[PDB]
Amino acid sequence: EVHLAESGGGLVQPGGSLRLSCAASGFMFSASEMHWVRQTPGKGLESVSVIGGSGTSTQYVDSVKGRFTVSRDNAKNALSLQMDSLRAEDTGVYYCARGGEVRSRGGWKNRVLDSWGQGVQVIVSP
Amino acid sequence: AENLWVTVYYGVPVWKDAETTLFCASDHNVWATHACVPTDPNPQEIHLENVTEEFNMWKNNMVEQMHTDIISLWDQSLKPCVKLTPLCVTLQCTNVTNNITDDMRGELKNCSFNMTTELRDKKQKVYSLFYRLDVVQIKEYRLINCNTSACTQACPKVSFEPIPIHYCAPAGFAILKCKDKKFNGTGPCPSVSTVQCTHGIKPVVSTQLLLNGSLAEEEVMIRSENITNNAKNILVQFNTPVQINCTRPNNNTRKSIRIGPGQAFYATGDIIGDIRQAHCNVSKATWNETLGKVVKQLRKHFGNNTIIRFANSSGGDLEVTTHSFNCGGEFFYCNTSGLFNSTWISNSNDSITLPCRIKQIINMWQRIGQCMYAPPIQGVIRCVSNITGLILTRDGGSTNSTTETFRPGGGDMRDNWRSELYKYKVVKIEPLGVAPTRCKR
Amino acid sequence: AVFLGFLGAAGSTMGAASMTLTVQARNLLSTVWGIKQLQARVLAVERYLRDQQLLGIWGCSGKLICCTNVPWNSSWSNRNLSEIWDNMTWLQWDKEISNYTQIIYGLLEESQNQQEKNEQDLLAL
Amino acid sequence: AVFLGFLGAAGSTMGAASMTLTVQARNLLSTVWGIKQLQARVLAVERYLRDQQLLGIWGCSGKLICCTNVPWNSSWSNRNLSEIWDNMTWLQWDKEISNYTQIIYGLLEESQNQQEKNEQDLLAL
Amino acid sequence: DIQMTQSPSSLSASVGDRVTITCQTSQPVNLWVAWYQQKPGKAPNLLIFGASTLQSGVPSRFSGSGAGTEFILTISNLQPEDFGTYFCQQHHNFPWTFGQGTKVDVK
């Protein structure tokens, strides 16, 4: 069974920095893409960032580009998100998810966020 | 390394464009259902998931096939009927002045003439009433068609009521239908299905207005092969229908005259009571709302700040100039001048009344040398119909003027069939295929 | 909906579409209007017989998935099975390889007779 | 010239003519004038189906050169293979043996059923 | 970025009712749309992927369809456990944009 556990959240002031860790088990970590998603209170979901299997390919949304950094450790099967210059809009619940390969009924292969973590709360307030 | 070998597969799902001959499927009439196969009570349609097809309503062979079949059926229906060859005689006509209004003065002529009978020796003097459009002066008049050809009298038993017809492809072929709404009849349709037969289509014959047609499911639609060019007609499909009530209030009477052995000619004996013009009524507020929707849609293609004008028809034959149709066996030609008369600038219970004229000598299709005589119908006539589309033509269109004027169109009946088969096409399957595989025989 | 049935596998991959050849195979066979219907019916039988003869001549008579002896030439197509049988549709493959159809037919025709001759020779002993 | 093709091997020996059966096999299938054309097409289809049925009944379905179990009677013909397969044409042989055609057909038909029955009996065990 | 629009924004339905949610994209995404469900205080759970494929273990009442730039999620037989916030996500090109969320609650 796939298991993902998040940690490292809490309270931070505006302009501070914070590291969120996600421990994964129950699957081949090196061969699965990893996603960081955030849910702001009272709003919908948003994909903060993505990192590939090899760890060389990383992408982020425009709202967090240049501030959020995503990294992975395949030996430890761990994922890390370093956030800097945090703002009030960054407050919310951060989830780490796996992009699992699935086959449609037509025989085509794509990747979806099959498994998610419990989430971790980050509050950016003075 | 690959060590691949050729493999034959039978039944591969591949199709190609093709043309074939479709056949009947239906649930005394001119549109003979006797030779048409019964329709299945539960037709089957298969939606093709993740299949995109190319469609072009202006290159459909189904329209040509339907036109040819309709013409053939019309020709066949008139074969066992009386031929009015003796009717070409010198008629002596006078004006009728018995209880007529101002607008119906001279519309009817009381004509007496000699005629043959069952015996080739004897002759009989008879009289009848004719329309001014059917008699041409030679006090002595003659039928308009006498110097062109002698045509048959439509048999009184057959009915001109349209009946739905379903078109079915043969084995080894398939019919693809586009279920994508807002599809304008040309381009890629992403939502496709395979249907064994086409839905019921009524072969309604009319000009300047589509009657008893199908309504768009989303909003008013505009279709044209080349909207920039003025020579191509514009097909407008409404979202909601407009009720039109047509009526001939004259109380007609029919009398049979024996012109030979087992041959009778039906004539209008006399009119009981007052004589008044037949006419049609159309709701005013509904028509205004429909025209508002139409101009709103037209502004998309012809600029957001242009002036949109509706005016009268240019000219030509009576069939193309006026709204021509048939109701209850009587052929009406209505003057649609009060409808398409307005201007639009970017920014209760009264009904529009259209007078109409009835005709008996008919040339339904654009053919010369084959007319048709409609026998008179006894009693007053009334009918109600749905307006669900228009055929419009752009005048001029040069860059000198920013004002766009549209006028009623028609004439060619292929447009009537094209308005229903715009979301259908026919293909033929190619089951055999070759691929690479790792076997070895 | 009736998504699956007859041509429902048109949008699926070749590997998935190869599992439902029978539903396409079945339907290939089945006063003025009667003449047109008869004329239409006359052509379907001819097409079916042509297809059956073409299949039988190659030695794959009475088979829906029949492999043969002629090897695949790399010139006609360079794509490998990895991106064909589960990353392509039958329509796309037919469109790509519609140009090179007849040569494989001729090769199969000339290959079948050699196998027949060899079988006769072995049975002669 | 197009000396070879369809019936080009008519004048050759039976051994040489047996190498090109496929060219003959292919071509067997393919307002007032249309009626005649339709009649001819119907007759051709009927003839092709008759030939296919006759081939199938003998157990040589889907084969161009198929030997069988019925032995050759010396009474019908006495010439040996030495003066037949390379010293005679197919037309000459058909002309010579046009009389004795039906008996061999009946023998083949009655022989096929026994083989089918024996195969069923063997598979029963 | 591809913009995702959901409809209706919120809805109240009773047990046994049929629920239909529509999702629209500004640009074609083939059929790479996935429908997820979220309960209060829980992470999202996938129901549909590929716009018509049901995830293993999900009840058969959930279904998805559509094409072009319009996709539909259908819950035929609403149950007490299906109430929550439904989202439609496109995963054809990065970024993978989610919808605004449709909240289905007890009437």
Ligand SMILES: *[C@@H]1O[C@H](CO)[C@@H](O[C@@H]2O[C@H](CO)[C@@H](O[C@@H]3O[C@H](CO)[C@@H](O)[C@H](O[C@H]4O[C@H](CO)[C@@H](O)[C@H](O)[C@@H]4O[C@H]4O[C@H](CO)[C@@H](O)[C@H](O)[C@@H]4O)[C@@H]3O)[C@H](O)[C@H]2NC(C)=O)[C@H](O)[C@H]1NC(C)=O
């Ligand atoms: C669009 O659709 C609408 C509705 O579908 C169409 O309007 C309908 O039109 C039909 C045909 O006109 C009409 O049906 C007639 O109703 C009359 C009044 O009830 C009937 O009297 C008439 O029956 C006569 O005609 C039949 C053949 O059509 C005969 O079989 C029948 O025996 C009757 O004929 C006898 O009587 C006449 C007159 O006395 C006599 O000359 C004969 O010898 C014979 O003795 C039809 O049943 C519907 O009532 C209309 N519907 C409505 C709601 O009004 C409309 O026409 C369509 N538009 C177009 C353009 O086609």
Ligand SMILES: *[C@@H]1O[C@H](CO)[C@@H](O[C@@H]2O[C@H](CO)[C@@H](O[C@@H]3O[C@H](CO)[C@@H](O)[C@H](O)[C@@H]3O)[C@H](O)[C@H]2NC(C)=O)[C@H](O)[C@H]1NC(C)=O
């Ligand atoms: C519905 O059908 C369409 C096509 O009929 C499917 O789109 C196809 O999706 C696959 C994804 O596996 C694409 O594969 C891609 O191939 C390119 C080749 O260069 C490669 O670079 C990519 O990495 C990827 O592997 C394929 O190209 C694409 N088809 C087209 C014509 O673009 C679609 O997936 C189907 N729907 C579903 C839900 O599967």
Ligand SMILES: *[C@@H]1O[C@H](CO)[C@@H](O[C@@H]2O[C@H](CO)[C@@H](O)[C@H](O)[C@H]2NC(C)=O)[C@H](O)[C@H]1NC(C)=O
């Ligand atoms: C059309 O003309 C005929 C003939 O003139 C009219 O029939 C005559 O009607 C008068 C009075 O109604 C009779 O006295 C005559 O005997 C009738 N003539 C015949 C030959 O019967 C007929 O009424 C006229 N119809 C109309 C509408 O004016």
Ligand SMILES: *[C@@H]1O[C@H](CO)[C@@H](O[C@@H]2O[C@H](CO)[C@@H](O)[C@H](O)[C@H]2NC(C)=O)[C@H](O)[C@H]1NC(C)=O
């Ligand atoms: C029906 O036929 C009669 C007889 O031919 C026509 O009456 C003749 O008309 C011509 C020309 O007007 C005269 O020269 C004859 O003297 C008339 N003969 C008789 C006996 O009247 C009569 O006009 C014809 N009917 C119609 C309507 O023209």
Ligand SMILES: *[C@@H]1O[C@H](CO)[C@@H](O[C@@H]2O[C@H](CO)[C@@H](O)[C@H](O)[C@H]2NC(C)=O)[C@H](O)[C@H]1NC(C)=O
């Ligand atoms: C739609 O009609 C316009 C008008 O005729 C076409 O454009 C013309 O094309 C002809 C072709 O030789 C030129 O001579 C004209 O100068 C063009 N006129 C304009 C105003 O462009 C146009 O090509 C048609 N549409 C299509 C798709 O062919």
Ligand SMILES: *[C@@H]1O[C@H](CO)[C@@H](O[C@@H]2O[C@H](CO)[C@@H](O)[C@H](O)[C@H]2NC(C)=O)[C@H](O)[C@H]1NC(C)=O
């Ligand atoms: C079309 O509209 C006209 C009025 O514009 C109608 O005329 C009236 O018809 C009724 C019939 O019951 C008469 O009682 C009235 O006296 C008529 N009034 C006028 C001013 O003509 C006509 O009936 C309508 N026809 C149809 C078929 O709806």
Ligand SMILES: *[C@@H]1O[C@H](CO)[C@@H](O[C@@H]2O[C@H](CO)[C@@H](O)[C@H](O)[C@H]2NC(C)=O)[C@H](O)[C@H]1NC(C)=O
């Ligand atoms: C055409 O005729 C229909 C009836 O055949 C008319 O419908 C009537 O509309 C009036 C409104 O003015 C209602 O009071 C009646 O109850 C309706 N009758 C029926 C049977 O529904 C319709 O209004 C007519 N159209 C026009 C433009 O006059």
Ligand SMILES: *[C@@H]1O[C@H](CO)[C@@H](O[C@@H]2O[C@H](CO)[C@@H](O)[C@H](O)[C@H]2NC(C)=O)[C@H](O)[C@H]1NC(C)=O
């Ligand atoms: C549309 O309206 C115009 C004028 O409003 C009509 O033109 C009239 O045509 C008649 C018949 O030829 C002439 O007697 C009039 O003098 C014309 N009027 C004008 C002002 O020129 C035109 O006929 C109408 N359309 C139809 C089809 O009748």
Ligand SMILES: *[C@@H]1O[C@H](CO)[C@@H](O[C@@H]2O[C@H](CO)[C@@H](O)[C@H](O)[C@H]2NC(C)=O)[C@H](O)[C@H]1NC(C)=O
């Ligand atoms: C159709 O109706 C219009 C409107 O009544 C007719 O136009 C009128 O025609 C008469 C000639 O009979 C003129 O005296 C009027 O001045 C015209 N009115 C307008 C507003 O132009 C038109 O003629 C009718 N169509 C036909 C073929 O007669």
Ligand SMILES: *[C@@H]1O[C@H](CO)[C@@H](O[C@@H]2O[C@H](CO)[C@@H](O)[C@H](O)[C@H]2NC(C)=O)[C@H](O)[C@H]1NC(C)=O
């Ligand atoms: C004119 O249009 C109306 C509305 O589309 C038709 O009434 C519909 O008829 C269908 C029958 O197939 C029913 O299923 C709908 O419920 C009806 N709708 C309404 C609002 O009544 C009407 O039948 C049409 N008239 C003609 C002659 O075709």
Ligand SMILES: *[C@@H]1O[C@H](CO)[C@@H](O)[C@H](O)[C@H]1NC(C)=O
């Ligand atoms: C009949 O009436 C019309 C219109 O009033 C007139 O033109 C014609 O000359 C009249 N014919 C007669 C009185 O013979």
Ligand SMILES: *[C@@H]1O[C@H](CO)[C@@H](O)[C@H](O)[C@H]1NC(C)=O
């Ligand atoms: C018949 O007569 C009308 C009017 O007199 C004329 O317009 C028409 O051309 C004539 N027909 C022929 C074939 O000349």
Ligand SMILES: *[C@@H]1O[C@H](CO)[C@@H](O)[C@H](O)[C@H]1NC(C)=O
């Ligand atoms: C409308 O028709 C034009 C004709 O060229 C076509 O290009 C366009 O794609 C059509 N609209 C849609 C939505 O397909």
Ligand SMILES: *[C@@H]1O[C@H](CO)[C@@H](O)[C@H](O)[C@H]1NC(C)=O
């Ligand atoms: C027409 O005339 C006949 C005969 O007098 C009569 O029975 C019928 O009622 C009349 N029709 C109308 C609509 O008045």
Ligand SMILES: *[C@@H]1O[C@H](CO)[C@@H](O)[C@H](O)[C@H]1NC(C)=O
């Ligand atoms: C056409 O519309 C004008 C108003 O723009 C009006 O004065 C005229 O009477 C109308 N003509 C007809 C025949 O209704």
